């Protein structure tokens, strides 16, 4: 259920793999990547610029 919910909101990355107990590693890799960039946490300084 959770993988499908993630697929619903994805844009461009989960598009490739499916959703099964063998696909899992791709999801975690994407989460690690979107944690490295720390991107979602620039928001309230950029809304100033």
């Amino acid at each position: 259920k959770r993988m499908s919910e993630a697929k619903r909101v994805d844009t461009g990355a989960l598009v490739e793999a499916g959703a099964d107990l063998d696909d899992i590693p791709v999801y975690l890799q994407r989460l690690q990547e979107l944690t490295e960039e720390a991107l979602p946490e620039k928001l309230n300084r950029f809304l100033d610029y």
Partner: protein, 50 residues
């Protein structure tokens, strides 16, 4: 004002140079621009302008 233009042109040049580098995250790019914006509130020229 021309001197400030010089700073912004130089920053653009350096940013493109670094983009051609393969090593930056998205965060690096989107953060260096804000660092530049705060960078030019220090020199007498930039202080004059702002």
């Amino acid at each position: 004002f021309r001197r400030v233009e010089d700073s912004w042109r130089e920053a653009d040049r350096a940013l493109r140079q670094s983009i051609i580098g393969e090593q930056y995250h998205r965060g690096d790019i989107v953060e260096r621009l804000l660092n530049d914006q705060d960078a030019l509130l220090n020199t007498p020229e930039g202080r004059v302008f702002d």
